[PDB]
mmCIF file of all heavy atoms in Angstrom:
data_model
loop_
_atom_site.group_PDB
_atom_site.id
_atom_site.type_symbol
_atom_site.label_atom_id
_atom_site.label_comp_id
_atom_site.label_asym_id
_atom_site.label_seq_id
_atom_site.Cartn_x
_atom_site.Cartn_y
_atom_site.Cartn_z
ATOM 1 N N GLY A 50 0.819 -1.218 -0.006
ATOM 2 C CA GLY A 50 0.005 0.001 0.008
ATOM 3 C C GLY A 50 0.851 1.251 0.005
ATOM 4 O O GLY A 50 0.391 2.279 0.415
ATOM 5 N N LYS A 51 2.080 1.132 -0.459
ATOM 6 C CA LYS A 51 2.993 2.271 -0.561
ATOM 7 C C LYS A 51 3.299 2.490 -2.048
ATOM 8 O O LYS A 51 3.410 1.520 -2.812
ATOM 9 C CB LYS A 51 4.285 1.988 0.183
ATOM 10 C CG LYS A 51 4.138 1.982 1.671
ATOM 11 C CD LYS A 51 4.357 3.388 2.213
ATOM 12 C CE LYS A 51 3.821 3.519 3.624
ATOM 13 N NZ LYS A 51 4.221 2.337 4.432
ATOM 14 N N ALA A 52 3.433 3.741 -2.434
ATOM 15 C CA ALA A 52 3.783 4.101 -3.818
ATOM 16 C C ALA A 52 5.092 3.438 -4.107
ATOM 17 O O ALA A 52 6.012 3.428 -3.270
ATOM 18 C CB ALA A 52 3.938 5.605 -3.993
ATOM 19 N N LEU A 53 5.158 2.850 -5.272
ATOM 20 C CA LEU A 53 6.353 2.300 -5.811
ATOM 21 C C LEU A 53 7.190 3.457 -6.335
ATOM 22 O O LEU A 53 7.114 3.830 -7.534
ATOM 23 C CB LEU A 53 5.966 1.292 -6.915
ATOM 24 C CG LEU A 53 5.242 0.012 -6.433
ATOM 25 C CD1 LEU A 53 4.691 -0.774 -7.573
ATOM 26 C CD2 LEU A 53 6.178 -0.907 -5.608
ATOM 27 N N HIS A 54 7.970 4.078 -5.433
ATOM 28 C CA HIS A 54 8.572 5.378 -5.740
ATOM 29 C C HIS A 54 9.659 5.693 -4.749
ATOM 30 O O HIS A 54 9.447 5.579 -3.561
ATOM 31 C CB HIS A 54 7.524 6.467 -5.649
ATOM 32 C CG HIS A 54 7.807 7.705 -6.441
ATOM 33 N ND1 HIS A 54 7.085 8.871 -6.265
ATOM 34 C CD2 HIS A 54 8.737 7.986 -7.398
ATOM 35 C CE1 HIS A 54 7.517 9.805 -7.110
ATOM 36 N NE2 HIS A 54 8.516 9.293 -7.804
ATOM 37 N N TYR A 55 10.832 6.063 -5.232
ATOM 38 C CA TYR A 55 11.955 6.411 -4.359
ATOM 39 C C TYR A 55 11.758 7.820 -3.716
ATOM 40 O O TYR A 55 12.356 8.143 -2.721
ATOM 41 C CB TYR A 55 13.231 6.374 -5.184
ATOM 42 C CG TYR A 55 13.734 4.984 -5.597
ATOM 43 C CD1 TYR A 55 14.319 4.756 -6.843
ATOM 44 C CD2 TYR A 55 13.741 3.908 -4.673
ATOM 45 C CE1 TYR A 55 14.889 3.502 -7.137
ATOM 46 C CE2 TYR A 55 14.285 2.690 -4.999
ATOM 47 C CZ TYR A 55 14.842 2.457 -6.225
ATOM 48 O OH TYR A 55 15.389 1.179 -6.479
ATOM 49 N N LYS A 56 10.874 8.641 -4.279
ATOM 50 C CA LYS A 56 10.770 10.042 -3.832
ATOM 51 C C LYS A 56 10.434 10.064 -2.385
ATOM 52 O O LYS A 56 9.469 9.439 -1.967
ATOM 53 C CB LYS A 56 9.743 10.772 -4.638
ATOM 54 C CG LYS A 56 9.538 12.206 -4.225
ATOM 55 C CD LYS A 56 8.583 12.858 -5.192
ATOM 56 C CE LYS A 56 8.002 14.108 -4.575
ATOM 57 N NZ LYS A 56 8.147 15.181 -5.560
ATOM 58 N N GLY A 57 11.243 10.759 -1.607
ATOM 59 C CA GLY A 57 11.027 10.849 -0.148
ATOM 60 C C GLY A 57 11.849 9.904 0.681
ATOM 61 O O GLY A 57 11.919 10.085 1.903
ATOM 62 N N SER A 58 12.445 8.863 0.057
ATOM 63 C CA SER A 58 13.084 7.775 0.782
ATOM 64 C C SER A 58 14.501 8.212 1.121
ATOM 65 O O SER A 58 15.013 9.132 0.503
ATOM 66 C CB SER A 58 13.022 6.475 -0.098
ATOM 67 O OG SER A 58 13.723 6.642 -1.338
ATOM 68 N N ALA A 59 15.154 7.568 2.072
ATOM 69 C CA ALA A 59 16.493 7.894 2.519
ATOM 70 C C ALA A 59 17.591 6.860 2.229
ATOM 71 O O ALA A 59 17.340 5.694 2.021
ATOM 72 C CB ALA A 59 16.457 8.133 3.989
ATOM 73 N N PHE A 60 18.845 7.319 2.246
ATOM 74 C CA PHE A 60 20.011 6.417 2.171
ATOM 75 C C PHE A 60 20.272 6.124 3.618
ATOM 76 O O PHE A 60 20.840 6.931 4.322
ATOM 77 C CB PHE A 60 21.242 7.043 1.484
ATOM 78 C CG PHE A 60 21.131 7.057 -0.023
ATOM 79 C CD1 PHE A 60 20.332 7.959 -0.643
ATOM 80 C CD2 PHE A 60 21.829 6.132 -0.813
ATOM 81 C CE1 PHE A 60 20.209 7.981 -2.025
ATOM 82 C CE2 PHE A 60 21.698 6.129 -2.186
ATOM 83 C CZ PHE A 60 20.899 7.065 -2.802
ATOM 84 N N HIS A 61 19.817 4.969 4.048
ATOM 85 C CA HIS A 61 19.807 4.608 5.464
ATOM 86 C C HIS A 61 21.128 4.023 5.898
ATOM 87 O O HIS A 61 21.385 3.969 7.049
ATOM 88 C CB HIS A 61 18.647 3.621 5.767
ATOM 89 C CG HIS A 61 18.804 2.274 5.133
ATOM 90 N ND1 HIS A 61 18.349 1.989 3.858
ATOM 91 C CD2 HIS A 61 19.490 1.190 5.543
ATOM 92 C CE1 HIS A 61 18.708 0.761 3.535
ATOM 93 N NE2 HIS A 61 19.387 0.255 4.542
ATOM 94 N N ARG A 62 21.977 3.551 5.011
ATOM 95 C CA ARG A 62 23.250 2.983 5.470
ATOM 96 C C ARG A 62 24.321 3.445 4.560
ATOM 97 O O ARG A 62 24.330 3.070 3.362
ATOM 98 C CB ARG A 62 23.136 1.478 5.468
ATOM 99 C CG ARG A 62 24.437 0.682 5.724
ATOM 100 C CD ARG A 62 24.054 -0.756 6.056
ATOM 101 N NE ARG A 62 25.227 -1.586 6.231
ATOM 102 C CZ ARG A 62 25.849 -2.260 5.269
ATOM 103 N NH1 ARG A 62 25.429 -2.254 4.009
ATOM 104 N NH2 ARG A 62 26.896 -2.985 5.569
ATOM 105 N N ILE A 63 25.180 4.329 5.084
ATOM 106 C CA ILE A 63 26.295 4.918 4.327
ATOM 107 C C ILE A 63 27.593 4.598 5.065
ATOM 108 O O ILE A 63 27.748 4.980 6.220
ATOM 109 C CB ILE A 63 26.141 6.443 4.115
ATOM 110 C CG1 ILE A 63 24.855 6.733 3.346
ATOM 111 C CG2 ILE A 63 27.377 7.033 3.364
ATOM 112 C CD1 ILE A 63 24.702 8.153 2.931
ATOM 113 N N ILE A 64 28.487 3.916 4.350
ATOM 114 C CA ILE A 64 29.786 3.555 4.868
ATOM 115 C C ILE A 64 30.913 4.211 4.032
ATOM 116 O O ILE A 64 31.225 3.756 2.891
ATOM 117 C CB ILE A 64 29.959 2.044 4.926
ATOM 118 C CG1 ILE A 64 28.851 1.418 5.827
ATOM 119 C CG2 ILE A 64 31.378 1.706 5.370
ATOM 120 C CD1 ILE A 64 28.953 -0.083 6.026
ATOM 121 N N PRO A 65 31.558 5.262 4.604
ATOM 122 C CA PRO A 65 32.607 5.950 3.814
ATOM 123 C C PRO A 65 33.661 4.993 3.258
ATOM 124 O O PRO A 65 34.092 4.063 3.915
ATOM 125 C CB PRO A 65 33.199 6.936 4.807
ATOM 126 C CG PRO A 65 32.123 7.109 5.850
ATOM 127 C CD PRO A 65 31.502 5.757 5.985
ATOM 128 N N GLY A 66 34.012 5.182 1.977
ATOM 129 C CA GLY A 66 34.931 4.337 1.295
ATOM 130 C C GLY A 66 34.451 2.996 0.781
ATOM 131 O O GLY A 66 35.217 2.285 0.180
ATOM 132 N N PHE A 67 33.186 2.661 1.023
ATOM 133 C CA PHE A 67 32.551 1.428 0.577
ATOM 134 C C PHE A 67 31.358 1.756 -0.374
ATOM 135 O O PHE A 67 31.445 1.529 -1.599
ATOM 136 C CB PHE A 67 32.065 0.639 1.817
ATOM 137 C CG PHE A 67 31.312 -0.618 1.496
ATOM 138 C CD1 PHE A 67 31.518 -1.334 0.317
ATOM 139 C CD2 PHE A 67 30.374 -1.121 2.429
ATOM 140 C CE1 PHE A 67 30.817 -2.492 0.067
ATOM 141 C CE2 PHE A 67 29.632 -2.255 2.158
ATOM 142 C CZ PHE A 67 29.854 -2.952 0.979
ATOM 143 N N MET A 68 30.272 2.295 0.191
ATOM 144 C CA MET A 68 29.037 2.596 -0.576
ATOM 145 C C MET A 68 28.023 3.347 0.232
ATOM 146 O O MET A 68 28.183 3.530 1.449
ATOM 147 C CB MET A 68 28.436 1.305 -1.155
ATOM 148 C CG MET A 68 28.056 0.229 -0.124
ATOM 149 S SD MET A 68 26.461 0.518 0.685
ATOM 150 C CE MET A 68 26.991 0.632 2.394
ATOM 151 N N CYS A 69 27.039 3.840 -0.516
ATOM 152 C CA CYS A 69 25.802 4.380 -0.053
ATOM 153 C C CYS A 69 24.602 3.474 -0.455
ATOM 154 O O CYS A 69 24.363 3.228 -1.645
ATOM 155 C CB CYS A 69 25.594 5.788 -0.592
ATOM 156 S SG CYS A 69 26.960 6.995 -0.430
ATOM 157 N N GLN A 70 23.819 3.054 0.541
ATOM 158 C CA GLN A 70 22.641 2.185 0.355
ATOM 159 C C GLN A 70 21.336 2.881 0.600
ATOM 160 O O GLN A 70 21.139 3.494 1.653
ATOM 161 C CB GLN A 70 22.735 1.006 1.324
ATOM 162 C CG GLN A 70 21.663 -0.048 1.241
ATOM 163 C CD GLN A 70 21.905 -1.220 2.170
ATOM 164 O OE1 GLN A 70 22.934 -1.330 2.821
ATOM 165 N NE2 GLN A 70 20.966 -2.158 2.171
ATOM 166 N N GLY A 71 20.423 2.751 -0.344
ATOM 167 C CA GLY A 71 19.059 3.196 -0.115
ATOM 168 C C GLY A 71 18.045 2.310 -0.806
ATOM 169 O O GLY A 71 18.287 1.121 -1.057
ATOM 170 N N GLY A 72 16.884 2.891 -1.078
ATOM 171 C CA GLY A 72 15.818 2.225 -1.793
ATOM 172 C C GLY A 72 14.745 1.597 -0.958
ATOM 173 O O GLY A 72 13.765 1.067 -1.533
ATOM 174 N N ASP A 73 14.901 1.610 0.377
ATOM 175 C CA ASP A 73 13.895 1.048 1.275
ATOM 176 C C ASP A 73 12.823 2.079 1.519
ATOM 177 O O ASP A 73 12.823 2.767 2.556
ATOM 178 C CB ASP A 73 14.498 0.527 2.604
ATOM 179 C CG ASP A 73 13.443 -0.135 3.515
ATOM 180 O OD1 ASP A 73 12.240 -0.198 3.105
ATOM 181 O OD2 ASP A 73 13.803 -0.584 4.639
ATOM 182 N N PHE A 74 11.881 2.171 0.557
ATOM 183 C CA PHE A 74 10.829 3.144 0.670
ATOM 184 C C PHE A 74 9.605 2.618 1.456
ATOM 185 O O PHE A 74 8.615 3.349 1.546
ATOM 186 C CB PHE A 74 10.378 3.640 -0.743
ATOM 187 C CG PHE A 74 9.862 2.557 -1.648
ATOM 188 C CD1 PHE A 74 8.570 2.071 -1.498
ATOM 189 C CD2 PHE A 74 10.662 2.027 -2.663
ATOM 190 C CE1 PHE A 74 8.097 1.031 -2.302
ATOM 191 C CE2 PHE A 74 10.204 0.992 -3.446
ATOM 192 C CZ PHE A 74 8.926 0.491 -3.255
ATOM 193 N N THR A 75 9.603 1.385 1.984
ATOM 194 C CA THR A 75 8.457 0.912 2.798
ATOM 195 C C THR A 75 8.777 0.901 4.274
ATOM 196 O O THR A 75 7.928 0.977 5.081
ATOM 197 C CB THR A 75 7.979 -0.513 2.412
ATOM 198 O OG1 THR A 75 9.019 -1.465 2.672
ATOM 199 C CG2 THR A 75 7.498 -0.542 0.946
ATOM 200 N N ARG A 76 10.027 0.798 4.662
ATOM 201 C CA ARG A 76 10.363 0.834 6.088
ATOM 202 C C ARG A 76 11.522 1.726 6.393
ATOM 203 O O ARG A 76 11.826 1.904 7.558
ATOM 204 C CB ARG A 76 10.678 -0.573 6.543
ATOM 205 C CG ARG A 76 9.467 -1.476 6.527
ATOM 206 C CD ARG A 76 9.912 -2.858 6.952
ATOM 207 N NE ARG A 76 8.960 -3.907 6.569
ATOM 208 C CZ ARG A 76 9.078 -5.187 6.906
ATOM 209 N NH1 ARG A 76 10.095 -5.633 7.669
ATOM 210 N NH2 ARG A 76 8.164 -6.052 6.504
ATOM 211 N N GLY A 77 12.234 2.284 5.414
ATOM 212 C CA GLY A 77 13.267 3.226 5.736
ATOM 213 C C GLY A 77 14.431 2.667 6.528
ATOM 214 O O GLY A 77 15.229 3.432 6.944
ATOM 215 N N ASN A 78 14.577 1.350 6.706
ATOM 216 C CA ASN A 78 15.675 0.812 7.555
ATOM 217 C C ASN A 78 16.474 -0.340 7.039
ATOM 218 O O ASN A 78 17.362 -0.829 7.762
ATOM 219 C CB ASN A 78 15.161 0.390 8.917
ATOM 220 C CG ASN A 78 14.089 -0.667 8.866
ATOM 221 O OD1 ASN A 78 13.704 -1.275 7.861
ATOM 222 N ND2 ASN A 78 13.545 -0.857 10.010
ATOM 223 N N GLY A 79 16.131 -0.837 5.851
ATOM 224 C CA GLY A 79 16.898 -1.944 5.301
ATOM 225 C C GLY A 79 16.120 -3.208 5.312
ATOM 226 O O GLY A 79 16.510 -4.176 4.612
ATOM 227 N N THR A 80 15.006 -3.225 6.039
ATOM 228 C CA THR A 80 14.186 -4.437 6.097
ATOM 229 C C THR A 80 13.073 -4.457 5.047
ATOM 230 O O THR A 80 12.538 -5.501 4.800
ATOM 231 C CB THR A 80 13.537 -4.660 7.482
ATOM 232 O OG1 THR A 80 12.723 -3.502 7.857
ATOM 233 C CG2 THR A 80 14.665 -4.964 8.511
ATOM 234 N N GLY A 81 12.784 -3.348 4.385
ATOM 235 C CA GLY A 81 11.601 -3.262 3.469
ATOM 236 C C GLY A 81 11.951 -3.129 1.996
ATOM 237 O O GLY A 81 12.999 -3.554 1.585
ATOM 238 N N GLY A 82 11.080 -2.540 1.206
ATOM 239 C CA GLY A 82 11.345 -2.344 -0.197
ATOM 240 C C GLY A 82 10.647 -3.426 -0.998
ATOM 241 O O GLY A 82 10.467 -4.522 -0.519
ATOM 242 N N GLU A 83 10.222 -3.116 -2.202
ATOM 243 C CA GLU A 83 9.620 -4.094 -3.053
ATOM 244 C C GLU A 83 9.813 -3.703 -4.506
ATOM 245 O O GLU A 83 9.990 -2.544 -4.783
ATOM 246 C CB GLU A 83 8.155 -4.267 -2.671
ATOM 247 C CG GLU A 83 7.214 -3.274 -3.270
ATOM 248 C CD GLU A 83 5.721 -3.517 -2.945
ATOM 249 O OE1 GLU A 83 5.296 -2.893 -1.994
ATOM 250 O OE2 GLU A 83 4.952 -4.193 -3.682
ATOM 251 N N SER A 84 9.773 -4.681 -5.413
ATOM 252 C CA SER A 84 9.992 -4.421 -6.834
ATOM 253 C C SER A 84 8.671 -4.146 -7.497
ATOM 254 O O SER A 84 7.641 -4.532 -6.980
ATOM 255 C CB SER A 84 10.651 -5.626 -7.549
ATOM 256 O OG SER A 84 9.757 -6.714 -7.764
ATOM 257 N N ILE A 85 8.725 -3.564 -8.681
ATOM 258 C CA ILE A 85 7.575 -3.437 -9.542
ATOM 259 C C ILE A 85 7.072 -4.790 -10.035
ATOM 260 O O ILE A 85 6.010 -4.858 -10.613
ATOM 261 C CB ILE A 85 7.821 -2.522 -10.783
ATOM 262 C CG1 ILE A 85 8.834 -3.096 -11.777
ATOM 263 C CG2 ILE A 85 8.185 -1.140 -10.314
ATOM 264 C CD1 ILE A 85 9.006 -2.355 -13.070
ATOM 265 N N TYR A 86 7.801 -5.867 -9.780
ATOM 266 C CA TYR A 86 7.349 -7.162 -10.283
ATOM 267 C C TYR A 86 6.545 -7.916 -9.250
ATOM 268 O O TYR A 86 6.033 -8.939 -9.577
ATOM 269 C CB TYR A 86 8.536 -7.983 -10.812
ATOM 270 C CG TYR A 86 9.377 -7.205 -11.827
ATOM 271 C CD1 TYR A 86 10.684 -6.771 -11.513
ATOM 272 C CD2 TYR A 86 8.870 -6.850 -13.071
ATOM 273 C CE1 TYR A 86 11.462 -6.070 -12.434
ATOM 274 C CE2 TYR A 86 9.640 -6.147 -13.974
ATOM 275 C CZ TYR A 86 10.911 -5.734 -13.654
ATOM 276 O OH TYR A 86 11.654 -5.028 -14.520
ATOM 277 N N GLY A 87 6.424 -7.428 -8.006
ATOM 278 C CA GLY A 87 5.800 -8.144 -6.893
ATOM 279 C C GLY A 87 6.894 -8.682 -5.986
ATOM 280 O O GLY A 87 7.606 -9.585 -6.331
ATOM 281 N N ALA A 88 6.989 -8.149 -4.813
ATOM 282 C CA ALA A 88 8.018 -8.478 -3.823
ATOM 283 C C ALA A 88 9.411 -8.542 -4.441
ATOM 284 O O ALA A 88 9.901 -7.510 -4.906
ATOM 285 C CB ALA A 88 7.622 -9.743 -3.018
ATOM 286 N N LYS A 89 10.038 -9.702 -4.483
ATOM 287 C CA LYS A 89 11.357 -9.877 -5.002
ATOM 288 C C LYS A 89 11.382 -10.494 -6.373
ATOM 289 O O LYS A 89 10.515 -11.314 -6.694
ATOM 290 C CB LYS A 89 12.225 -10.748 -4.075
ATOM 291 C CG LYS A 89 12.285 -10.359 -2.605
ATOM 292 C CD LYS A 89 12.341 -8.867 -2.342
ATOM 293 C CE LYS A 89 12.741 -8.531 -0.907
ATOM 294 N NZ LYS A 89 11.579 -8.620 -0.055
ATOM 295 N N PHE A 90 12.421 -10.159 -7.130
ATOM 296 C CA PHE A 90 12.635 -10.764 -8.445
ATOM 297 C C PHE A 90 14.006 -11.451 -8.560
ATOM 298 O O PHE A 90 14.933 -11.253 -7.752
ATOM 299 C CB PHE A 90 12.306 -9.787 -9.636
ATOM 300 C CG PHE A 90 13.212 -8.611 -9.744
ATOM 301 C CD1 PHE A 90 14.209 -8.554 -10.739
ATOM 302 C CD2 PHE A 90 13.125 -7.572 -8.846
ATOM 303 C CE1 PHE A 90 15.093 -7.457 -10.814
ATOM 304 C CE2 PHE A 90 14.002 -6.480 -8.910
ATOM 305 C CZ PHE A 90 14.967 -6.400 -9.909
ATOM 306 N N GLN A 91 14.047 -12.328 -9.525
ATOM 307 C CA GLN A 91 15.213 -13.141 -9.860
ATOM 308 C C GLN A 91 16.487 -12.273 -10.199
ATOM 309 O O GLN A 91 16.360 -11.191 -10.757
ATOM 310 C CB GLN A 91 14.768 -14.012 -11.039
ATOM 311 C CG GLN A 91 15.737 -15.092 -11.394
ATOM 312 C CD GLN A 91 15.307 -15.892 -12.628
ATOM 313 O OE1 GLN A 91 14.893 -15.335 -13.704
ATOM 314 N NE2 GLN A 91 15.496 -17.228 -12.552
ATOM 315 N N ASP A 92 17.686 -12.708 -9.796
ATOM 316 C CA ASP A 92 18.936 -12.146 -10.301
ATOM 317 C C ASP A 92 19.011 -12.286 -11.795
ATOM 318 O O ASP A 92 18.941 -13.401 -12.310
ATOM 319 C CB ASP A 92 20.122 -12.850 -9.682
ATOM 320 C CG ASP A 92 20.251 -12.573 -8.237
ATOM 321 O OD1 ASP A 92 20.042 -11.420 -7.829
ATOM 322 O OD2 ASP A 92 20.474 -13.532 -7.482
ATOM 323 N N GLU A 93 19.047 -11.167 -12.515
ATOM 324 C CA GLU A 93 18.879 -11.163 -14.008
ATOM 325 C C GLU A 93 20.096 -11.810 -14.676
ATOM 326 O O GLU A 93 19.938 -12.778 -15.384
ATOM 327 C CB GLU A 93 18.703 -9.751 -14.483
ATOM 328 C CG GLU A 93 18.426 -9.654 -15.969
ATOM 329 C CD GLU A 93 17.963 -8.271 -16.350
ATOM 330 O OE1 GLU A 93 18.076 -7.304 -15.501
ATOM 331 O OE2 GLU A 93 17.437 -8.167 -17.484
ATOM 332 N N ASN A 94 21.271 -11.300 -14.368
ATOM 333 C CA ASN A 94 22.537 -11.925 -14.732
ATOM 334 C C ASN A 94 23.629 -11.275 -13.913
ATOM 335 O O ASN A 94 23.385 -10.246 -13.232
ATOM 336 C CB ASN A 94 22.869 -11.766 -16.246
ATOM 337 C CG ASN A 94 22.992 -10.324 -16.684
ATOM 338 O OD1 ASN A 94 23.861 -9.557 -16.234
ATOM 339 N ND2 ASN A 94 22.093 -9.921 -17.572
ATOM 340 N N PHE A 95 24.831 -11.855 -14.008
ATOM 341 C CA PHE A 95 26.044 -11.305 -13.362
ATOM 342 C C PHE A 95 27.118 -10.919 -14.401
ATOM 343 O O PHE A 95 28.287 -11.064 -14.205
ATOM 344 C CB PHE A 95 26.533 -12.273 -12.273
ATOM 345 C CG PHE A 95 25.543 -12.441 -11.140
ATOM 346 C CD1 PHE A 95 24.790 -13.618 -11.030
ATOM 347 C CD2 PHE A 95 25.278 -11.406 -10.220
ATOM 348 C CE1 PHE A 95 23.850 -13.776 -9.988
ATOM 349 C CE2 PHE A 95 24.332 -11.554 -9.208
ATOM 350 C CZ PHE A 95 23.600 -12.747 -9.114
#
């Protein structure tokens, strides 16, 4: 019941010299997020 949309969401885990992580627009903490395909999708390729 949340907009499938990054607008408003935060980079909740930033580690200098490694990366910046975001995209959790349903819980804002690393436990949430969902794809446009329904929950999770397959690893496309490597």
Side-chain angles (χ1 to χ4, degrees):
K51 289 271 163 44
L53 292 170
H54 204 192
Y55 288 142
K56 178 174 161 131
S58 61
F60 282 75
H61 67 271
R62 171 165 177 270
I63 300 188
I64 301 183
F67 176 27
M68 59 82 239
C69 311
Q70 183 176 355
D73 183 0
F74 60 78
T75 64
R76 292 178 199 185
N78 58 8
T80 58
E83 83 176 95
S84 74
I85 67 173
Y86 308 110
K89 308 321 193 277
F90 66 105
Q91 190 184 45
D92 292 319
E93 184 167 12
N94 60 63
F95 296 105

